Structure 1
Amino acid sequence: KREHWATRLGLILAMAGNAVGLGNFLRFPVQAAENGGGAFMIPYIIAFLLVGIPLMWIEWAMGRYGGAQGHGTTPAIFYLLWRNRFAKILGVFGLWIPLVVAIYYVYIESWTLGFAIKFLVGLVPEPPTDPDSILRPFKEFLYSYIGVPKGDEPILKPSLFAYIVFLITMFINVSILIRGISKGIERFAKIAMPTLFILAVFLVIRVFLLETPNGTAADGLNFLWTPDFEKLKDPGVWIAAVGQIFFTLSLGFGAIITYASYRKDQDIVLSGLTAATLNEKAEVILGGSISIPAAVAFFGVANAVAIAKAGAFNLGFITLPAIFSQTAGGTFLGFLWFFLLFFAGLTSSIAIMQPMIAFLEDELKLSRKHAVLWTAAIVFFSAHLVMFLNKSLDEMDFWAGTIGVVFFGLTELIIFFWIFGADKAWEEINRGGIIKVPRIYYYVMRYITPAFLAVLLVVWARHWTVWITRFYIIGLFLFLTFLVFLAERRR
């Protein structure tokens, strides 16, 4: 018998753990600070209402609909809606995207674990005062961990501690996934989400008390929420907003679908809305009130924007620890920060590995033990690419996490609302609950959302170390297409 979420709330809490992750505390501050903070929020809100919320309901519908027929993954669920062979091929992306994203997501999550260990024990840089002299020791601290070469070289030389901690991170993910849906993920989400909420609120309160001659914690909140309608015409802001919305809500990652497949009795309208608002609260209230207000309080708005533009990890791994280190007990604040990130990423990595696990369980009839171990071997083996090859992690985040989920999000929209039938999809979404979707969203999900994506997708169009990554992940797609072929012959 297929696994089962014990309670309706347990699925909602695990869905919040799926959504709330490193994108709320690491990706969102960088995206907002890059695109002007407040000027970024208007397209972010519009993208959340026109793309985020509707796609959250759809994927939950396809998952619950497919889960009633014993299928959790997209290759089988796409075929149920569209009885076509090409539907199974496009469904491979629902296994390929979560696999490629988990290759680098779990590794970045291992950094938060390793940093939390050394910050707890107190093995952090020592500063004695220009901002560069406080920020430089922590920049060298991160570069020694992941093994960045001095200047430019195609090969990374990560530390032995980082490689060992990555093994521990893979072991922790397996330990949770090996126990299953109810006894493992649902059990862990009930504990991690309150811990996530308590740590973040404590950090937000501590950050809010920071004040220097150059800035105030409230100055960063004013920078993030004062809108700028002049930058509304910038297409780059709309691209960053929709891409951010896809990432934080786990849209196009095939993770919402498999999670929803383990519960037939569920109001997907209220459950999908609760999980989204829970994620957006942690994103713009908690994640938005830590990194940006602390950076602005110590360096000002102008320098805080330049810091977020220097790198994706420059804020949460370098600037925020160095800022904390200038305060009493800041080494412990650093520990609480990365411990906050570790629980945020751990509850999301187990969510993006279950799709490949559910495929081996449901389509190839493998036991959960063998399913978890085999997908873990795929993730651990492939992770050596992003561990040692410079810019290899950036190529995976682009193809699978950036352009893939947008392409896959439009694909599941068309299959569900255009091929399967808009009225059948509308019936399936609002079925089985007291909360019903307003009728206006029927036109958003049938006309607005697909046109909004397609228009934004075509308006997007305007070192050999990347070819190894392209060559590798292409083989990952061919390998998963092969198993979908094998699972079709067994049936």
Structure 2
Amino acid sequence: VKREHWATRLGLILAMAGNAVGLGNFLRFPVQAAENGGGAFMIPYIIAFLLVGIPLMWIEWAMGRYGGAQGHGTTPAIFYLLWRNRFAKILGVFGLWIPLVVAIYYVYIESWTLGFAIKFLVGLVPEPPPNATDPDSILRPFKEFLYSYIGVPKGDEPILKPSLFAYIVFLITMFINVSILIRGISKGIERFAKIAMPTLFILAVFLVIRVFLLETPNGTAADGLNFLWTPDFEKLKDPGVWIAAVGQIFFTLSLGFGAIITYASYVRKDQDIVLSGLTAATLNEKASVILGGSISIPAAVAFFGVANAVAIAKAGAFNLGFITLPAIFSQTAGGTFLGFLWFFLLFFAGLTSSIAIMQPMIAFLEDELKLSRKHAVLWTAAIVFFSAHLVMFLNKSLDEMDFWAGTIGVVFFGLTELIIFFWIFGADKAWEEINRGGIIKVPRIYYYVMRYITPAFLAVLLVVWAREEETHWTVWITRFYIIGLFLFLTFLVFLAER
């Protein structure tokens, strides 16, 4: 049984870390953190990591490597292997659907960063003057820059209008993903991680350091880190703090996307996954809390003050990353260069991720329909590139996909993979597989944390918010399409049966 396998431990680890350490860590985490009060977030975030992130990851690595040894890297096949049943194959489809759909808006956002980076380099960006009473006059220019890039509706009709440059950069971005994926796990995804992850780190640290030195009449970067890392044991009982948290742990760690599983399916039948997994997870938590957390917020707080901060977070993940930060940098020395690094950092962080959520579909086509990698890769590119047109042109199409696939879906799927592995398959058999070949071993306690805690924890979540009715008629367009994708992925699964 061929199937590719990680060339080297480090190569593996870094690919996996690149799987997780994406636009989420940098655009999304900062916003979640400052939205809920800041110090109210960092704690539930860490716990959820210990109580959900870790347990769930070891599980995915385990299911991935387990299936890998039998020729299967995706969840319709894997779910069925562990749990012989028809309903297994059907639920397994979400491990193709979620990545596919997320990939469909992700690579587009990823392409923005590239486009800004190019324009910053060449200095085709706005360079507003110094204003000490018209902050509006510094944001406005940057605000108009993004809106013109993506074609934000100026009237009403929920219709976007990408620039030719935005569209063309999307093509380039897709091409780059293909050029990487079309080389496979080691000679492609792995080769790229070894180059990209270090690069990403240095850019990240540099910006972290450089942002730390930020200081204006309105505050200091220091004040932002304080706001993030100074606890508030009050709220911490209001559990919207544990919804944002547990939920963020999924996206940030790429859990419930079928992706960790697919990558793990390349790991040799007897290679360690206990230490490797733990290492990668940790790199991710570092990249988020230290790196991601210490750039945009501390910078915004430095320029706007700590109160005008929670409001900026509430403004959304795109305002901060694509409007506010660039506006801030434009007021600091050599700030045009600071924007470039930022967007190049985001780009490489996006790229190491997008290739991860495109692999499940590619792996399925090779494993189950027996396509050549070239074909498996190009058809997946076609489906993603084609489908992304809905995201580029239809207002709030992105929000809708992000919600169903990227927010709800991952959690339900997280809970589902756990139940199939640690309950249906056999908690004991699962615990052994997870520990087999372990350079280190899983602290026993965890066995009880995945067989009862983790699943309970998730059940409570899915129950709480689920406790609690219209919306633009256009959401139904996006909902129609992605439901269509499911019907279609299900059909393909049905065809792989003979």
- TM class by shorter-chain length? over 0.9
Q: Distance in 1 between matches of 2:437 and 2:396?
A: 47
Measure the CA separation in 2 of the matches of 1:214 and 1:255.
43
Residues 349-397 of structure 1: CA deviation (Å, up to 9, x unaligned): 0000000000000000000000000000000000000100000000000
CA deviation profile, 1:288-322 (whole Å, cap 9, x unmatched)? 11001000000011112111111221111111111
Scaled by the length of structure 1, the TM-score of the pair is: 0.99
| SS across alignment from 2:65 | helix
Please state if 1:469 is matched with 2:474.
no
Point out the more displaced range, 34-43 or 187-196.
Answer: 34-43
TM-score by length of 2: 0.97
TM-fit CA distance, 1:177: 0.3
CA distance in 2, matches of 1:264, 1:190: 23
Number of corresponding residues: 489
Structure 1 residues 152, 306: closer, same or farther in 2, change over 3 A? Answer: farther
Cα 1:293/1:151, change in 2 over 3 Å: farther
Structure 1 position 7, deviation (Å): 1.0
What's the offset of the Cα at 1:436? 0.5
Does 1:483 pair with 2:492? Answer: yes
Measure how far apart 1:348 and its partner are: 0.3
**Separation in 2, partners of 1:405, 1:78:** 16
Q: For 2:397 and 2:258, how far apart are their aligned partners in 1? A: 23
Aligned to 2:80: 79
Q: How many angstroms does 1:126 deviate by?
A: 2.5
- Rounded Cα–Cα distance in structure 2 between residues aligned with 1:149 and 1:348: 29
State the shift of 1:234 in Å: 1.2
- Distance in structure 2 (CA, Å) of the matches to 1:191 and 1:126: 32
- How far residue 413 of structure 1 moved from its aligned partner, in angstroms, is 0.5
Q: Which runs of 4+ in 1 moved over 3 A?
A: none
Bigger drift between 22-31 and 148-157 goes to 148-157
- 1:425 equivalent in structure 2: 430
2:309 and 2:283 map into 1 onto residues whose CA distance is: 27
In structure 2, distance between residues paired with 1:105 and 1:302: 31
Q: Structure 1 residue 264: deviation in Å?
A: 2.4
| Aligned equivalents of 2:310, 2:155: Cα separation in 1 | 23
- Say which is worse superposed, 86-95 or 262-271, in terms of deviation: 262-271
Q: Secondary structure at the match of 1:266?
A: coil
- 1:153 Cα deviation after fit: 2.5
In 2, the alpha carbon distance for the partners of 1:466 and 1:265 equals 46
- What's the CA shift string for 1:115-168, capped at 9, x where partnerless? 000000000113126521111110111100011012532100111100000000
Q: Secondary structure at the match of 1:230?
A: coil
Contact 2:48 2:245 in 1 (8 A): yes
Provide the C-alpha distance between the structure 2 equivalents of 1:49 and 1:341, rounded to a whole number of angstroms: 26
Aligned to 2:234, the other structure's residue is in SS state helix
1:57 shift after superposition = 0.3
CA distance in 2, matches of 1:151, 1:15: 43
Partner of 1:265: 270
Deviations 1:225-259 (A, max 9, x none): 00111110112111101111000111000001110
Number of the residue aligned with 1:145 = 149
Write out per-residue CA displacement over residues 7-26 of structure 1, whole angstroms, 9 at most, x where no aligned residue. 12211110000011101111
Residue 329 (structure 1) shift: 1.1
1:226 to 230, 237, 242: 230
SS at match of 1:460: helix
Range that drifts further, 55-64 or 307-316? 307-316
Deviates more, 1:332-341 or 1:125-134: 125-134
SS for the counterpart of 1:450 is: helix
**Does the 8 Å CA contact 2:130/2:331 hold for their aligned counterparts?**
no
- For 1:291 and 1:45, locate their aligned partners in 2 and report how far apart those are by CA, in whole Å: 20
Shift of 1:169: 0.2
State how far apart, in whole Å, the 2-side matches of 1:86 and 1:248 are. 29
Question: SS where residue 256 of structure 2 aligns?
Answer: coil
By how many angstroms is 1:328 displaced? Answer: 1.6
Residue in structure 2 matched with residue 207 of structure 1 by the alignment: 211
Q: Who is 2:39 aligned against? A: 38
**1:189 partnered with 2:199:** no
Post-superposition Cα deviations, 1:418-456, rounded to whole Å, max 9, x if no partner, equal: 100000010110111230001110110000000000011
**Partners of 2:23 and 2:346 within 8 A in 1:** yes
Aligned counterpart for 2:316 among listed residues 311, 316, 319: 311
Mapping of 1:161-172 within 5 angstroms? 161-172=165-176
Q: CA deviation at 1:265?
A: 3.3
**1:324-366 deviation per Cα after TM superposition (whole angstroms, max 9, x unaligned):** 1111211111001000000000000000000000000000000
Output one character per residue of 1:452-472: Cα deviation in whole Å (capped at 9) or x when no partner.
000110111241110000000
Give how far 1:5 is off. Answer: 1.1
SS in structure 1 of the partner of residue 358 of structure 2: helix
Task: Kindly state the Cα deviation for residue 267 of structure 1 after the two structures are TM-superposed.
Answer: 1.3
Does the 8 Å CA contact 2:75/2:92 hold for their aligned counterparts?
yes
Q: Secondary structure at the match of 2:116?
A: helix
Structure 2 CA distance for aligned equivalents of residues 294 and 310 of structure 1? 16
Q: Any conservation in 1 of the 2:146–2:322 contact (CA below 8 Å)?
A: yes
Partners in 1 of 2:491 and 2:339 — Cα distance?
45
Distance 1:129 1:111 in 2: 27
Identity of aligned residues (%): 99
1:9 and 1:109 mapped to 2: Cα distance? 25
**Do the aligned residues in 1 keep the contact of 2:270 with 2:436 (CA within 8 Å)?**
no
- Distance, in Å, in 1 between the alignment partners of 2:54 and 2:112 is 31
Measured against aligned partners, the alpha-carbon deviations of 1:10-58 in whole angstroms (never above 9, x if no partner) come to: 1111000001110111110011011111101111111101110100100
**Which range moves more in the overlay, 67-76 or 311-320?**
311-320
